[PDB]
Amino acid sequence: QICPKRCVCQILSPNLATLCAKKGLLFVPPNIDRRTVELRLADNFVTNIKRKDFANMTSLVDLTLSRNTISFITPHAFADLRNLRALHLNSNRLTKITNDMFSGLSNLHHLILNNNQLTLISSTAFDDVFALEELDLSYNNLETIPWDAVEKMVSLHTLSLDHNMIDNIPKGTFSHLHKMTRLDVTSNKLQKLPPDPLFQRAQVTFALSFGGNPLHCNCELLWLRRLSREDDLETCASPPLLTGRYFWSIPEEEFLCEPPLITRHTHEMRVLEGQRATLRCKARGDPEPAIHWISPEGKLISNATRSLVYDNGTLDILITTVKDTGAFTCIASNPAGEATQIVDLH
Amino acid sequence: ICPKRCVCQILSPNLATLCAKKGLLFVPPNIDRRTVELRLADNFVTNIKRKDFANMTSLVDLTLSRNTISFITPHAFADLRNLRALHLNSNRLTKITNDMFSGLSNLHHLILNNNQLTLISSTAFDDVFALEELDLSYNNLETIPWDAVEKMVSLHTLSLDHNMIDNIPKGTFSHLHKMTRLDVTSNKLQKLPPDPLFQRAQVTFALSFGGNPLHCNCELLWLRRLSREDDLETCASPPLLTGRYFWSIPEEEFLCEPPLITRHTHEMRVLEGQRATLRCKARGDPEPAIHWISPEGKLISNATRSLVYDNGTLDILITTVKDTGAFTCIASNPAGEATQIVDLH
Amino acid sequence: ETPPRFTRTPVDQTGVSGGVASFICQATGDPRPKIVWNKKGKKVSNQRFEVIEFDDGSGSVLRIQPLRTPRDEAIYECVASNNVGEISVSTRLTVLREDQIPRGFPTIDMGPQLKVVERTRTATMLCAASGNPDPEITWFKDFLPVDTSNNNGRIKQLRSRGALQIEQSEESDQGKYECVATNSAGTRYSAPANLYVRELREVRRVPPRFSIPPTNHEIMPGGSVNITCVAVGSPMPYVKWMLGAEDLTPEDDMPIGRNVLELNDVRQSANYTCVAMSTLGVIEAIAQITVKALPKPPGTPVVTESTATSITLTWDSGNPEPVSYYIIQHKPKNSEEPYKEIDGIATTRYSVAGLSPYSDYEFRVVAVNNIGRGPASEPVLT
Amino acid sequence: ETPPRFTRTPVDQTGVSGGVASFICQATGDPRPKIVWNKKGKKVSNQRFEVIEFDDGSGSVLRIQPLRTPRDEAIYECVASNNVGEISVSTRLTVLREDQIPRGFPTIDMGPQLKVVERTRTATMLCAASGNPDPEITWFKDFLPVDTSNNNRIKQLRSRGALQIEQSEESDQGKYECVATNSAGTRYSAPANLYVRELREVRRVPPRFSIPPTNHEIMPGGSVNITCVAVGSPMPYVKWMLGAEDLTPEDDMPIGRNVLELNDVRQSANYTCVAMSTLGVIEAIAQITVKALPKPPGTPVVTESTATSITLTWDSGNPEPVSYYIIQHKPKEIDGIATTRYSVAGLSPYSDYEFRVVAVNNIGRGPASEPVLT
Ligand SMILES: *[C@@H]1O[C@H](CO)[C@@H](O[C@@H]2O[C@H](CO)[C@@H](O[C@@H]3O[C@H](CO)[C@@H](O)[C@H](O)[C@H]3NC(C)=O)[C@H](O)[C@H]2NC(C)=O)[C@H](O)[C@H]1NC(C)=O
Ligand SMILES: *[C@@H]1O[C@H](CO)[C@@H](O[C@@H]2O[C@H](CO)[C@@H](O)[C@H](O)[C@H]2NC(C)=O)[C@H](O)[C@H]1NC(C)=O
Ligand SMILES: *[C@@H]1O[C@H](CO)[C@@H](O[C@@H]2O[C@H](CO)[C@@H](O)[C@H](O)[C@H]2NC(C)=O)[C@H](O)[C@H]1NC(C)=O
Ligand SMILES: *[C@@H]1O[C@H](CO)[C@@H](O[C@@H]2O[C@H](CO)[C@@H](O)[C@H](O)[C@H]2NC(C)=O)[C@H](O)[C@H]1NC(C)=O
Ligand SMILES: *[C@@H]1O[C@H](CO)[C@@H](O[C@@H]2O[C@H](CO)[C@@H](O)[C@H](O)[C@H]2NC(C)=O)[C@H](O)[C@H]1NC(C)=O
Ligand SMILES: *[C@@H]1O[C@H](CO)[C@@H](O[C@@H]2O[C@H](CO)[C@@H](O)[C@H](O)[C@H]2NC(C)=O)[C@H](O)[C@H]1NC(C)=O
Ligand SMILES: *[C@@H]1O[C@H](CO)[C@@H](O)[C@H](O)[C@H]1NC(C)=O
Ligand SMILES: *[C@@H]1O[C@H](CO)[C@@H](O)[C@H](O)[C@H]1NC(C)=O
Ligand SMILES: *[C@@H]1O[C@H](CO)[C@@H](O)[C@H](O)[C@H]1NC(C)=O
Ligand SMILES: *[C@@H]1O[C@H](CO)[C@@H](O)[C@H](O)[C@H]1NC(C)=O
């Protein structure tokens, strides 16, 4: 029944809606009816929100904070919004996305964060909105997002990343997300794209846009080339021989990959009696090879005790044991090559 | 003559190179240096180098709108002696160093809207003093080199639609008679200086100052007496006026407060040449201005032999043998001139 | 008719480039002398030059803004001409550049700031200057010189700070007030300052008064207490806290009307002073904060009842604060051994039973409160 | 006609939740046995359950994705039925949760990554596993099991159970999954699409030095840029070695052209220029020798002496050859003496002289030797 001054709140059965768009507000209205259901604070000038603002608003199903000067959000301020379905935080000055923000938003289906200055998104910050349908993170400064939380969003259909600086993207994503119908990743810093059956459905139901990206046109992107999509002015960046030319203007036979080659490995080493033994093995190629090591029989552990692994191509066994001598062999995984060399220790 | 994927047409008398919406990742390597118009709008260039716009002397109009530019090499916009219009809107620029716009005398149009500008180094505009338009809307700016702006007599349009500007000097817009439009919406302005250009905004000149944390005192009474149209302006302080519209408040409610000295030093005995610090502070709306007087004159500011103004503290460094006399603390204010006295020995 | 006679002739002033220079000229006669300004026998034409007619219409003021050099370094003349006659006087203008400023040139130490005073009240435009020799102060309202000749009652220049005290302000006082310093070296103008005059605000002026005085308190050692002090009135007073010599609150953060001091770790009893101050005087108030300490020794126990094997003791509390219980110390007459204590006495009387026949005993009483145990009182023999 | 006979019956598999489990079933007969999968006498209906028909049409594969528990813990049966008869066999399914995983359960140490091989070339899908006991590796192409029974094109490697596909073809394109299985249970690995492209035909030419490292002679403590250029397809990685030690960290290695920037050369030593591609390793040597100042020659000895002439003889006093010598004389220097002997003429009769000899080479002028009286 009670709506703040300068606000036009209308009552319709059975839900109360409070409209406060374009009112020149400097901060959130102090006395908004807590049993409201729709709240429009769009096109105002609010700088920051407090817990007391949206404290007891349980019946709220739609909140609109579009086009403001919001720079900071109180932790646990979006709490008690159990029935909130749509949230609009577009066009603001948000910097970070902490877990305390969107905690308790189970029924949230629409989450909009476009046209902001997002730099970092803390992990598990999306582990409560796992049942949303739309996520707009376009026009930001993001490079990485909590992908693990995204994979748990089966009901997702629209993911917007129109303008960012995203480094790369995991391969295991879009597995359970069968509901995906639109994905835009234009204007980012993506080097490659993982193969997915949803992308096979984009030939002439699903509409994707990947233009304006520093594509690494190798054999790892051949699947997308065979895909006969319409030209969206995509452009390659590497190899240098393909730099500049359109992604669709390049024949399928020119998307080549290179088999690895081990440059240098340790010839022999004498670190018995348990002294620290450091082994060296490295290989190069396009794309970058994957170095794995073998014992006389079997392969060792990754990032754990008794073994050092992956990048650097260097085995460090910390304090070695007295008897670890045998036959060790270095390999290099690649979409087109499997180069290898051997090294003995005593 | 013209790079691949680019449609550069030759029409009398100026050469134009068009490369809009081409998905470019960086500046085309072989653009004709004797070009006059260059459109690189709606692309995806990340950074510019000196070799890009090195010898483009005949260039009069450059358009780099809607890109992903985050860094530009110093002295890359050099040798653009005949450049009149520059469009750098919708990008990811962070800082404005002096090396950027150095040598752009003939620049009339400078556009920097929709960016992430945090700092603008001084004297960075001391070469574009003859521009006609400056768009700095939609940024993170709080202060700009006003000194460089005052030397822009031919200015008519200054856009600041969305920023975080603290305040604005009073001496500006003096010689800038050509000003016809100034927008300062959505900022953090506390007050506005009185200027004859604002008197010309009654019902030629169009100003917008909505969405600001206005400090509705008697210092803004001149703007209230000005019977402009309601642009949804809202006051923030004093708390008694917080929330209500700027135009819904009568002129008689815009009040100021006379200063009052809270605490002052009773007496002082500063022999042995030690530092003599006196304390005097006053409160009011708006904040008073503390000045000190000698027996008949006032001392120097922020220079040798005297410490002054803010903190409200006279520090005479190493005091002399004979500085005893009558000293008096004052507090300037639009409505009050309270004062008290203190002696030293 | 009467030929024009100069009532006030323009003088040679030396201004600085980028500044402002104004020349005054007015004369009388029949008919009224129409004054025209000329340069090299030619009337002024440039936009930067503007002529302002006096209210009398008997004179005009030539204002040059801004000043440049050597574009404006020339000789100008003022021609006052009517039907009966025509007269003229010449004067020189010197515009020194920024690199020509001498040591001892007039400097605005403090220019006039924006001021607003209600109608029929005193207005005070402030200004200050320095240099060699000491420059004198002249004011310029609406590009016109201010008549501060003698003490009339309306507009007076102050002398022992050449301020512009305008008593009984009115509608006509609204305008742009400029400050001007001038000596033998040259002339410098100050920053403009708009003066606005509003209607009288009928507000009741009431001195500061404590609405809620600081109530006394008694807190245990190393505790905490919220002491509140509230003052009201128009104008509202700024309330602070002092311990007599020292102040607690910073002079930047002083609350209005209500000040609540949040104490912590109270070590020693002391009085704190609550001071509220407005423009109508300064009032004070005292808050009593006392620390409760160990109990004082009770009244000397007196043998009220006495038998062969039992002795009843009675005593006074000897304390302003309530006592929890008492502890009776007891030992034989000449016993040089440590006392024996009877704990758990909720009353002021207790009967010590189990004594020896024909034996004198010594009894002491100790008081114990919430804090702890105090000293023992003087004993009693029997 | 002949009633259906099971040639291979599905077995009890223990999968994990969130993973994938597939059951195989195929039989023969006339006509061909049309296989239908049933649960509790009911045909499968849920979306997560999918049946894949064999190429033969004599069997079908039931794929369950993803696995859940205990939602999917039940017994299933495979019914192969035709016109002449109908047969069926049952099997048990155990679905362990992530917090129910026993100690020693199969773990994918290395899953199959994306690979691309041209037509008529060797493809090698890799995989590895661990656990107790040691699980064996089975592959699943396009949700169907790969026939690697015996050496027939596609062979599983003897122990690292890779999938060596010799003579690749069009049909080889698909999704290759890796599966490990022991007595504890069954675990699937991450899928990996394999694509086959046309023959590229690139000329494979071993590394060859286009511009070999030229020899150099530098003064003591003199910096020098030695250049080494190699060409060929594919381009070789050129590096530099001091025989035992290397300069470049091998992380930043140029292609075709490598310029070594040396500094402060104190002692003569050999630098090795090595270029290496996939077609072998070649080597080259760059000569860096330090030229020094000449040592002072042997003390000059008066072999012959007359009234107006005195003959000088001396040793070179240098291991390296000396261009010429300079004789100092006074009661003035004589330049341009290409030999180790010189007769100083134009002297006064009965006069004692002092003689010094100085050596000069390509670098400059050395010290003067110890004098000699006469
Ligand atoms: C660095 O490069 C040099 C080639 O330019 C090599 O210089 C050689 O050093 C050798 C001695 O180690 C010399 O070999 C001798 O040659 C004579 C005949 O010339 C033989 O009678 C000797 O038996 C033989 N001695 C040995 C031990 O081989 C070479 O004369 C000399 N060659 C040149 C052109 O100078 C260096 O060998 C080489 N150093 C390394 C570590 O590789
Ligand atoms: C485990 O291996 C990974 C590399 O795969 C390392 O993870 C990195 O950790 C830092 C934070 O400490 C991140 O900023 C990097 O982005 C991670 N790198 C990658 C490629 O993800 C990690 O350093 C390893 N941990 C140990 C102990 O070796
Ligand atoms: C990659 O390379 C450098 C050495 O080239 C590693 O530096 C070593 O780090 C370990 C500690 O983790 C130290 O004990 C060694 O002393 C370091 N080696 C040297 C030569 O300084 C670096 O840690 C390596 N990083 C990874 C992920 O393997
Ligand atoms: C711009 O034009 C000038 C000359 O028109 C270029 O300067 C010449 O550059 C070449 C080598 O690139 C030299 O051989 C000439 O000696 C230079 N001439 C002069 C007068 O310096 C200049 O290189 C051009 N700018 C760029 C970035 O290439
Ligand atoms: C706080 O205020 C009370 C009230 O004045 C003080 O009590 C007085 O103390 C003096 C001696 O200290 C006595 O001579 C007076 O008779 C007392 N007057 C009253 C009304 O009690 C008290 O001493 C003060 N305490 C402190 C720490 O300043
Ligand atoms: C190797 O070659 C380079 C040029 O090819 C030499 O360049 C020197 O360093 C910079 C170039 O980055 C120039 O500004 C200097 O003027 C150059 N110095 C000289 C003496 O040319 C470099 O000298 C060479 N390096 C060595 C160790 O000899
Ligand atoms: C919210 O609801 C609770 C009732 O449990 C009430 O105590 C509290 O005061 C309310 N807060 C606000 C800001 O209305
Ligand atoms: C004077 O000095 C202080 C620091 O000493 C400085 O921060 C301040 O900006 C100066 N103020 C003026 C008016 O010069
Ligand atoms: C200004 O006030 C602060 C009090 O916090 C003091 O620390 C500082 O020394 C003062 N500055 C000067 C120059 O005295
Ligand atoms: C007294 O001050 C403390 C400060 O923490 C606060 O918690 C408490 O609520 C206050 N109590 C009252 C009555 O103001």
Numbering used by the authors:
A (entry chain D): 18 to 221, 232 to 373
B (entry chain B): 19 to 221, 232 to 373
C (entry chain A): 28 to 187, 196 to 417
D (entry chain C): 28 to 179, 181 to 187, 196 to 367, 375 to 417
Please quote the paper that reports this structure.
In the PTPδ–SALM5 complex, the electron density of PTPδ Fn1 in one complex in the asymmetric unit was unclear, probably owing to the structural disorder. The second interface is formed between PTPδ Ig2 and SALM5 Ig. The third interface is formed between PTPδ Ig3 and SALM5 Ig. A pseudo-C2 symmetric hydrogen bond network is extensively formed in the dimer interface. In the central region of the interface, Arg110 of one molecule hydrogen bonds with the main chains of His180 and Asn157 in another molecule (hereafter denoted by * after residue numbers), whereas Asn158 hydrogen bonds with Gln134*. The notable feature of the PTPδ–SALM5 complex is its 2:2 stoichiometry, which is required for its synaptogenic activity.
In mammals, the type-IIa RPTPs have three members, PTPδ, PTPσ, and LAR. These members possess a large extracellular domain (ECD) consisting of three immunoglobulin-like (Ig) domains and four to eight fibronectin type-III (Fn) domains, followed by a single transmembrane helix and a cytoplasmic domain harboring two protein tyrosine phosphatase (PTP) domains: the first PTP domain is active, while the second domain is inactive. SALM family proteins have five isoforms (SALM1–SALM5). Their ECDs share the same domain organization consisting of a leucine-rich repeat (LRR) domain, an Ig domain and an Fn domain with 35% amino-acid sequence identity. We determined the crystal structures of apo-SALM5 (LRR–Ig), and PTPδ (Ig1–Ig3)–SALM2 (LRR–Ig) and PTPδ (Ig1–Fn1)–SALM5 (LRR–Ig) complexes at 3.08, 3.16, and 4.18 Å resolutions, respectively.
